[PDB]
Design a protein around this ligand. Sequence first.
Ligand code: E64
Length: 215
Amino acid sequence: APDSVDYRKKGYVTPVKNQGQCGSCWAFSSVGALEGQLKKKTGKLLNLSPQNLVDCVSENDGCGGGYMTNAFQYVQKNRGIDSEDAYPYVGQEESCMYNPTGKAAKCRGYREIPEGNEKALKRAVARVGPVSVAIDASLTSFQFYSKGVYYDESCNSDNLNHAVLAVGYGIQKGNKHWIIKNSWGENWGNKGYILMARNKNNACGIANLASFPKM
Ligand SMILES: *[C@@H](C(=O)O)[C@H](O)C(=O)N[C@@H](CC(C)C)C(=O)NCCCCNC(N)=[NH2+]
């Protein structure tokens, strides 16, 4: 796997979204991974619908929280997920209104990365593309991050609370990091992204709950 890879430079990443006051991070994390694969497969990069997920995944709890794995299964069984245009994000839970004529993508499963294995996470990013990951984003240092490779010894590998997207990896000024796309808008972090510590003992549980869909 290359020493560094940024899928943004490859055009596998859609612009940063804002989940608003809805706990839909799992939906945005899921959508980002699917958008990455849709690109790999069809050559087109389109915005998929996180709202479709929020309203339709009964195994998850809409704005109350959920898992990316449940989301991928829903897309697989549903046999499709609508585009952002066919199913706009409102940021509130509503009855499932899936429209098959707005179907932009499909899913045939998901693969999970071994718990805590950052080497596996790396191998996966360099081969498949953007991977969905869960981290502990409760620290106020994470909240106010603006630049550099983020790392705070207070981060909790066993307190995963935020779903996010691993969009690449590399090294800054001697510090290896993961390129993480957040869903807290552009005004957050570095234009919506954060460089998180790579190989520093599974920083924030970055490699504890990762997965990606198969098409
Ligand atoms: C994240 C956010 O919107 O900021 C949102 O709280 C969320 O979905 N968080 C996840 C975090 C990781 C997946 C650990 C979460 O808490 N998921 C599990 C919540 C339990 C809900 N129960 C199920 N299975 N529907």
